[PDB]
Structure formats: C-alpha cells, structure tokens
C-alpha cells in the first residue's frame, strides 16, 4: 500500500542512448495499461534538439533493453523538455514553446485534448535547476494524473494540480513553499510531492516533501545517487512502485520503500 518515502535504492541502468540526441530524454511505462498495450510496453523519447517528434515504442521490456522499437510515433507538434508521462493509453506532453499540455492517444495517434495550464511559466521561466525548459512536469501516482509547475503568483514556488485525464481540466491545486528552480526534479508518491536536491551529485538527497492530504511540508535526507552526473528526468511509476529517470544518456530505475 501507500506510505511515506523512506528509502531509494541504487540506480539500475536498463538502456543507454548511443547518440547526443539522447543526452536527456524521458522513458516510461503506463501504470494503467489499456489495449493493445500491456504493463511491459515501454516508450522512449530522446529530447535533445528543437524539433522533437519521434516517440519510440517497444512491446516488450526485452525489446526496450536490447532492440529496435516495435513502432515509432511521429507527434503532430514538437514536444518540450522531459516532463511527459503515459497514462491509460495516452501520452501527455507539452507543446514546444507553449504552456499547452496535449493528450495524444497512442493506439489511434489522435490528439484527444489540449489545455493551457493556467498561469504556468514556460520555456525557461520556472525550470528545475539544470534548466532544459523543464518548467512543466507531468506526474502519475496512485490517484491518477498531475502536473507540476509554477506561476508568477506563486513566485516560482512549486505548484501542483490534479488533472482530469480525459479533458485535462484542473481539478484541485496546491501551492508549496519550494522554489522550483532550486531543486533538480520532483515526483509524486501517494499524494506527496518529493524533490531531489541535485542532478549532478553521487550524494544527492530527496530533500523536501509536501503532503497534499495534510498540507504539511517536511525536510528529508534520503540518499539519491546520480550515477552519471546529469539527471534530466525523474518520475515515479505507481504500478511498478519505482522511480524512472534519465541520467546523462542512461535510462535508469530506482527501487523505493514506503513506510
Ligand atoms: Ca518529474
Ligand atoms: Na514527468
């Protein structure tokens, strides 16, 4: 079940990009897989450049780890940065040079919804500390779909909103006290937002928490290792109960333990 994060394991490298295009990126699985996909289906996006549109899809974990894609989707619009997620059959991603989140149904290659995140900074206003236009970070946890961002009104502090996954309407919004550009990335577990302290250090920590259920903010000191010294993407998968990350060409995963 659910609980507070109390431990992160060592990063395990599952695949390594072979070109500069994959220096940063996002890779993910669907915590609520829908036909024709399964819990093994993996998606990979190498996100260096200004016209990122190729989504690599693998039917099997074995193919993701050793082979070519089983299918490539070409997005109808270029994608921004590393914050995207897959949820219940759709890729949720941010349009380049925009504050728009797009719901792209993977099995039909159809855009089903688009939504400006109200007031969200974009394109280098409130990125995480490494930059990379990481202003807007989607997240899936045990309760469904979220987006992590900030606004002028929040003065750059992390804001997070629960999202309706069908039409992308904002359902509830919380404002933390954590300056988004002062942390390396963030993710949500069991309704609690966690941040990572550094994207370069082998001795980083999960250093802040904000619990949306209680409104309480905490400091933490849970060790977190950036094995390759440049983590551009850190998300949580609530089906696997693992962190998925992209660290300097390497697609890695971390075990976790909850209280
Ligand atoms: Ca994240
Ligand atoms: Na994300």
Residue numbers in the entry: 244 to 502
Please give me the paper's original passages concerning this structure.
At the outset of our study, five variants could be confidently predicted as benign polymorphisms: T293K, T353I, K398R, A445V and K500R. Three of these variants harbor conservative substitutions (Lys to Arg, Ala to Val). Assessment of spent media from cells expressing each of the 16 full-length myocilin variants revealed WT-like secretion for T256M, R296H, L303I, S313F, V329M, S331L, T353I, A445V, V449I and K500R. No gross changes from WT OLF were detected for the structures of T293K, R296H, L303I, V329M, S331L, E352K, T353I, K398R, A445V, V449I or K500R, indicating that these mutations are accommodated within the native five-bladed β-propeller fold and do not perturb the dinuclear calcium-containing site.
Among the common features associated with pathogenic myocilin misfolding, we demonstrate that a single metric, OLF thermal stability, can robustly segregate benign from early-onset disease variants.
